[PDB]
Design a protein around this ligand. Structure first.
Ligand SMILES: [Cl-]
Ligand SMILES: [Cl-]
Ligand code: NA
Ligand code: NA
Lengths: 16, 16, 16, 16, 16, 16, 16, 16, 16, 16, 16, 16
């Protein structure tokens, strides 16, 4: 799967 | 809101 | 075009 | 994180 | 299927 | 335009 | 609702 | 950034 | 496949 | 138009 | 919820 | 990367 990084602050990974 | 990073070069933030 | 970065491991660029 | 709401009847949250 | 809601005003459903 | 409502917490509108 | 125009050939509207 | 076009009528740009 | 258009300037076609 | 498949159980088509 | 199938190789289900 | 399948008729793969 792919993990997209994003700022939510903290950096999080969005897994797909 | 989340900020996705992308190369446009410079790094920019895409606000959602 | 924009290049999104994602962890696939190694970091890859997704061109759009 | 964002939570999108959707009727699946019943309301569910789609977490991102 | 899922029904997403949006304000178009009136609330509408987007079916998927 | 459309406004999607999501929980960001607080309920916010994403305008498109 | 919004209509997106895309080539499918002919250029058609995708309704949302 | 990219600008996608959509029919709202007017033809608008959705900027990304 | 669908070809989405966007202004990048020049109009570009994104193939899907 | 494209048809994406998804398990909704039965397998259905999502038309775009 | 819908389950999209995708090749990651193995076939996996993406749940929404 | 992920490959989504779709009917375009032949079945095609969308690479990501
Ligand atoms: Cl920026
Ligand atoms: Cl899943
Ligand atoms: Na907010
Ligand atoms: Na920048």
């Amino acid at each position: 799967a792919l993990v997209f990084f994003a700022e939510d602050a903290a950096i999080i990974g969005l897994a797909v």
